[PDB]
Structures are given as C-alpha cells and as structure tokens.
Amino acid sequence: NQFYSVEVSTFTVLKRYQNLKPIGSGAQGIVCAAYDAVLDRNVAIKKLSRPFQNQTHAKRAYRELVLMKCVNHKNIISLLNVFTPQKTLEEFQDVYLVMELMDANLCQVIQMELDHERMSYLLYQMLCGIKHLHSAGIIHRDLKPSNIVVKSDCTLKILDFGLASFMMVTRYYRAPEVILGMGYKENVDIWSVGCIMGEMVRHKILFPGRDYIDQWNKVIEQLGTPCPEFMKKLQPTVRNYVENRPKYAGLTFPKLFPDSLFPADSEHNKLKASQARDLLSKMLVIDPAKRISVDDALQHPYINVWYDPAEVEAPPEHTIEEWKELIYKEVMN
Ligand SMILES: COc1ccc(Nc2ncc3nc(Nc4ccccc4F)n(C4CCCC4)c3n2)cc1
C-alpha cells in the first residue's frame, strides 16, 4: 500500500512522509511536522478527521479546498499535496493537507521582542496577503495569530480564509462590525492587523473577553465610545445596547502604546516608534469609514520601505452526506 499508519489519534499517510511529530492541534485538525523524501524537505501535514461531520467543519474544510486554487501568493498558504488514504466515497473519512514547514506561528513571535525592521516586515506581508485575498473577492474577517506562520528569515504566510453554527473559538481580533453584526467591507481585516500589531508591542491581547459582551467593553474602555455617524449604521437593537453602555473618553495612542514598549534608543528607532504608533492609531479605528484601507496601509511610511509592485499588485446549506461528497470530489479534484 501507498500509505502507512502511526499514532499521533492515528495518522495514515503517504510513504514519502517520514518521522511525524505533532506540532499543532485545533478543533479542525492535528498538524504534524514530517520529512518529505520525494521533495527532500520538511512539510506540515494536517489531518482533518471526518470534516463532513457537521456544517461548521464541513463548510470550512470545503471552502478552503476551493479557495486554495483561487490564490497564488507567497503570503498565503499554498498546498504541496492533498490526499485521502480511503479509496471510495463510502469509505472516505479523512483529508490530509500538506504544505511547506515553517518555523513558528505568530503567537510565538508575538511573545518576542522584535526590532522594527522585522515587526514592519511581518506587517507588510500580512497586508500583502490580505491585499491578495481581497483582490480575489475574499474578505477574511477572522484573521488571527494562531493561523499565521513564520520562518526564521522573517517570511510569513496566512493559513486560513476566515468566515463566510454549533459544535461540541478565539474572537479577540474581530472588527467592531463583526462584533456588532453590521455591514463590512475590505478594511474589516485592517482591524485584525492592528490588533495583532498592538499585541506585538504590548505583549498582551488588546481586547480580551469571555464573549462579545466583555470584548466590546475592552474596545470602548481603550479607544473610547464611538461617534454618532457610527451608530446610524447599527441595527436598532444593537444600536440601543451600544448607545447604553458606560461611556469612555478612551486613551490617546501614546498612553495605549508608550515609548517604554518600543525599541526607541537611537534616532532611527525613535522615528520608527512614532510611525508605528501613527499606523496603530489608523488601524485600530472603531468606525470602518474612518479606518485606513489596505492600500493606504501599504503606503504608510512604517510599511512602505518594503513596498514592491511585484508583491503588492499581483495575480488572482447541506446535509452531511451532501458535504461528504462535495469534499470528496474536491479532494479528488
Ligand atoms: C512548535 O510550534 C510550531 C508552530 C508552527 C510551526 N510551523 C508550522 N508550519 C506549517 C504549518 N501549517 C499548519 N497548518 C496547516 C494549515 C493548513 C494546511 C496544512 C497545515 F499544516 N501549521 C499549524 C501547526 C500549529 C500552528 C499552525 C503549521 N505550523 C512549527 C512549530
């Protein structure tokens, strides 16, 4: 047989993949690092166990398999291989996704001190990734550091495609318009970038909460109560919940993110600190009509030192049995 099985939970993989070591584990899959003998390099292999098992797993698994082919960008996951060990639709149980092995996820990187050259490099790439997604008609809406990976050479990839409802979820990076069920447009994703950036500086999650109720409170306690023309776009029930919580002035950006947090010894670093704080103050903006756009974020001085036309301006429900077959066929391409 082409496949062999190992306990990791059982991984049943193609024989080219050697010496599996578990490296990750979310609701969606276990991920192993492995050596790929055919390509002569290391890969990450994610097992999606019976993903047609509910609407949630199914939609995500299915959607991300289709979207794979609609993207082609170094800052967005590319698949090396897609496979199932099972040979028939009836036997079908598991999907394995193979990609390049990176060195770390953003959670890990966030915990480090990074200079501005790196910090800004990570961010330029997130924005190039997101720019790519948007040009393909994909607004992500759920960008977060545990789905973002990095290499030692500071290169970065976004691994998932976001949102499009029960099962037996980290929300901290979601935009107000997502937190409050409003219309959104492409700059919804800018907010999540500003949350990841804030976190890189502060080393704490900007807006923690048990659910959207606490989370909103952390938003307003820091950025202050939003403005009139923001309310006008809230559904009347959310509007009135939102027009009735304790108000806040909200702290300026130098209180939010003091010099203390920034590499700021040399003149170069004092200047980069000011510019990083300028971008933060432009991205973490409650009201989307006043939030910076992806293209303006890419022209910001903190980010534009990396700018490269080639990188920036580039390419482009169901029952469980219905999902099993949709996903099977996709895997079979
Ligand atoms: C020790 O802590 C780490 C963390 C990350 C790495 N490096 C690393 N590299 C590639 C990855 N691809 C995925 N997922 C994935 C997504 C879609 C298709 C296929 C996949 F495998 N992950 C998850 C593992 C946990 C973090 C993200 C990956 N992690 C190495 C070590």
Side-chain angles (χ1 to χ4, degrees):
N1 196 232
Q2 274 158 145
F3 298 88
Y4 79 91
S5 292
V6 260
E7 300 142 307
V8 167
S9 211
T10 278
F11 273 63
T12 299
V13 303
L14 289 171
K15 271 173 174 161
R16 58 187 295 167
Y17 304 124
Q18 306 170 194
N19 199 193
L20 272 67
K21 301 180 41 236
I23 58 180
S25 196
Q28 212 201 7
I30 292 85
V31 186
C32 284
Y35 171 64
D36 175 351
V38 172
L39 254 29
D40 184 33
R41 72 156 143 157
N42 302 324
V43 301
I45 304 172
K46 184 181 207 177
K47 183 197 178 195
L48 263 32
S49 168
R50 301 193 62 82
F52 43 80
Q53 74 180 264
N54 56 77
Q55 223 59 209
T56 303
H57 280 148
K59 274 212 92 210
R60 185 150 208 120
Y62 166 74
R63 153 158 213 295
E64 297 192 338
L65 233 17
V66 165
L67 294 186
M68 204 49 68
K69 312 115 47 153
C70 306
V71 302
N72 170 44
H73 186 109
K74 56 196 220 179
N75 300 121
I76 306 290
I77 192 201
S78 272
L79 260 25
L80 292 182
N81 204 1
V82 174
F83 76 81
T84 164
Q86 296 90 210
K87 339 166 155 82
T88 69
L89 172 76
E90 281 64 55
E91 293 172 292
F92 177 66
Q93 278 224 295
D94 304 323
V95 180
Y96 294 80
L97 311 179
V98 195
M99 67 176 289
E100 173 171 1
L101 181 65
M102 312 279 286
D103 296 322
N105 74 7
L106 247 202
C107 290
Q108 295 163 326
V109 174
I110 270 168
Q111 286 152 71
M112 324 181 303
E113 282 192 4
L114 302 156
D115 52 286
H116 286 287
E117 227 210 347
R118 288 181 170 87
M119 208 147 277
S120 64
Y121 191 53
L122 294 163
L123 293 165
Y124 166 68
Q125 293 177 93
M126 290 179 225
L127 288 158
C128 291
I130 278 139
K131 163 109 156 149
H132 195 67
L133 263 20
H134 295 173
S135 69
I138 301 149
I139 303 171
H140 189 297
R141 271 155 59 203
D142 202 17
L143 181 73
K144 69 190 98 189
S146 65
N147 308 325
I148 296 178
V149 284
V150 307
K151 278 215 288 192
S152 285
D153 66 358
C154 216
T155 55
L156 180 144
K157 285 155 142 75
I158 302 185
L159 304 176
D160 79 305
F161 297 85
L163 275 12
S165 219
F166 162 82
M167 53 181 22
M168 16 257 290
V169 173
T170 96
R171 314 199 222 42
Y172 313 136
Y173 308 84
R174 281 162 190 204
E177 53 277 36
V178 180
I179 290 161
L180 301 163
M182 64 192 96
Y184 65 77
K185 77 198 141 156
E186 17 295 298
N187 83 358
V188 73
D189 291 321
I190 284 301
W191 170 279
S192 313
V193 177
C195 287
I196 281 133
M197 186 173 187
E199 197 178 331
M200 273 166 164
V201 183
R202 181 186 291 180
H203 306 278
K204 283 139 124 6
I205 309 174
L206 269 33
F207 312 116
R210 278 161 303 166
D211 68 1
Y212 287 156
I213 306 297
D214 296 332
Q215 187 169 331
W216 181 248
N217 290 348
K218 294 310 255 203
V219 180
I220 63 177
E221 293 174 12
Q222 283 174 95
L223 309 198
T225 299
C227 68
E229 159 79 285
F230 180 69
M231 312 323 196
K232 270 202 227 56
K233 295 286 135 182
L234 253 25
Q235 285 154 340
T237 311
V238 187
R239 192 203 287 242
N240 134 99
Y241 155 67
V242 149
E243 311 195 63
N244 265 274
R245 299 280 73 48
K247 309 86 178 43
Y248 290 92
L251 320 180
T252 63
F253 282 71
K255 302 309 205 175
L256 279 171
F257 306 98
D259 296 331
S260 343
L261 310 186
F262 283 112
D265 47 359
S266 78
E267 289 281 11
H268 175 272
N269 290 335
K270 307 175 184 314
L271 180 47
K272 298 278 163 213
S274 130
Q275 295 180 353
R277 205 196 277 111
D278 186 64
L279 194 62
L280 270 165
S281 79
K282 288 195 176 136
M283 293 197 75
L284 291 161
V285 162
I286 289 170
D287 181 358
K290 321 312 287 306
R291 205 176 302 152
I292 201 167
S293 77
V294 172
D295 303 299
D296 286 349
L298 286 154
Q299 297 308 125
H300 185 102
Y302 190 68
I303 303 295
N304 73 231
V305 306
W306 305 108
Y307 190 104
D308 174 347
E311 298 165 332
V312 169
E313 54 225 67
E317 197 62 304
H318 296 288
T319 70
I320 59 192
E321 51 151 48
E322 286 159 346
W323 283 120
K324 187 185 194 215
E325 150 91 274
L326 274 175
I327 299 171
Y328 189 58
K329 300 179 109 53
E330 208 40 70
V331 181
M332 294 307 108
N333 74 255

